[PDB]
Design a protein around this ligand. Structure first.
Ligand SMILES: Cc1cc(C)n(CCNC(=O)Nc2ccnn2-c2ccccc2)n1
Ligand SMILES: [Mg+2]
Ligand SMILES: [Zn+2]
Length: 313
């Protein structure tokens, strides 16, 4: 119990900030995650032996893909840590426990292909899960790893608390399907504006936790410009591979995924910021005022992409 994780001074301070980058040293990422669980949840939330075994099994079931990798998992978990630490009294013990684990597990066994590509390929997972194909697989993989011997980090919870936490994790992981984000934010927008939003209404909490998951999942657009710009290369490396694979199935990919149309990228980032990212962090800031730094950072980056187009960089 008396064993803490401590980070070097620069990390100890910068990790509290939304725009923190976890760095290129992979062997430090597990310690950073445990540090965040201990401060967000407590030193007692998990058996340290079981947590460490869970963390390393989760790492092993992420693939060596350009973007949807172990680094993304830890990055999305850090953004959730930042939201929880800035909204101390709004979330229950089970929710803080659940959401950090959901973020770490949210893209388990990702291959770097969209739900659309699985459907057009006719992948077995598309036959097994007709909607949110990859996300149902990510939750399936999470349950698998929790059921390995020595890996059940929730064993000390009651039967009902256990079922509650697995239901928080399931909903959280399904919400990372961007196809579900558009309707979810629209509903939250109306509820906030007509004043019907009620955080004691479980169906309302679910929607708010969903938007947090979208905000955390997209947080690469809220980093300082040099981090956002370099992460964009990894996300587009996956999109171009998928577009190559669409061409192999005899389907011309949308321009965003066509590597012959790299010129169109800056304008494609504009569309993504205006259609997805700005609306996402605007609604999140209305519902959770202390997440405003994510909206500010997103706006700064929209303006940096505007400069790329105007040939100023
Ligand atoms: C860095 C960093 C991290 C992330 C996630 N991006 C965004 C990369 N673009 C992207 O994901 N596009 C996308 C996927 C599905 N729909 N759309 C889409 C929606 C509206 C307009 C244009 C495109 N950059
Ligand atoms: Mg995903
Ligand atoms: Zn993700």
């Amino acid at each position: 119990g008396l064993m803490q994780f401590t980070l070097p001074v620069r990390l100890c301070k910068e990790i509290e900030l939304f725009h923190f980058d976890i760095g290129p040293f992979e062997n430090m990422w597990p310690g950073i995650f445990v540090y965040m669980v201990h401060r967000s949840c407590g030193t007692s939330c998990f058996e340290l032996e079981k947590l460490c075994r869970f963390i390393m099994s989760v790492k092993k079931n992420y693939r060596r893909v350009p973007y949807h990798n172990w680094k993304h998992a830890v990055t999305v978990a850090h953004c959730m840590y930042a939201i929880l630490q800035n909204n101390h009294t709004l979330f229950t013990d089970l929710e803080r426990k659940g959401l950090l684990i959901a973020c770490l597990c949210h893209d388990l066994d990702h291959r770097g292909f969209s739900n659309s590509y699985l459907q057009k390929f006719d992948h077995p997972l598309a036959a097994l899960y007709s909607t949110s194909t990859m996300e149902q697989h990510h939750f399936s993989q999470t349950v698998s790893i929790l059921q390995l011997e020595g890996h059940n980090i929730f064993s000390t919870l009651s039967s009902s608390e256990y079922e509650q936490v697995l239901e928080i994790i399931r909903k959280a992981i399904i919400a990372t399907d961007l196809a579900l984000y558009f309707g979810n934010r629209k509903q939250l927008e109306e509820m906030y504006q007509t004043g019907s939003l009620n955080l004691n209404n479980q169906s309302h909490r679910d929607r708010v936790i969903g938007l947090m998951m979208t905000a955390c999942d997209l947080c690469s657009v809220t980093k300082l410009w040099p981090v956002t710009k370099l992460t964009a290369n990894d996300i587009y490396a996956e999109f171009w591979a998928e577009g190559d694979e669409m061409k192999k199935l005899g389907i011309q990919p949308i321009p965003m995924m066509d590597r012959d149309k790299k010129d169109e990228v800056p304008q494609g980032q504009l569309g993504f910021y205006n259609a997805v990212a700005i609306p996402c962090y605007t609604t999140l800031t209305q519902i959770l005022p202390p997440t405003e730094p994510l909206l500010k950072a997103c706006r700064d980056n929209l303006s940096q992409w505007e400069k790329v187009i105007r040939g100023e960089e």
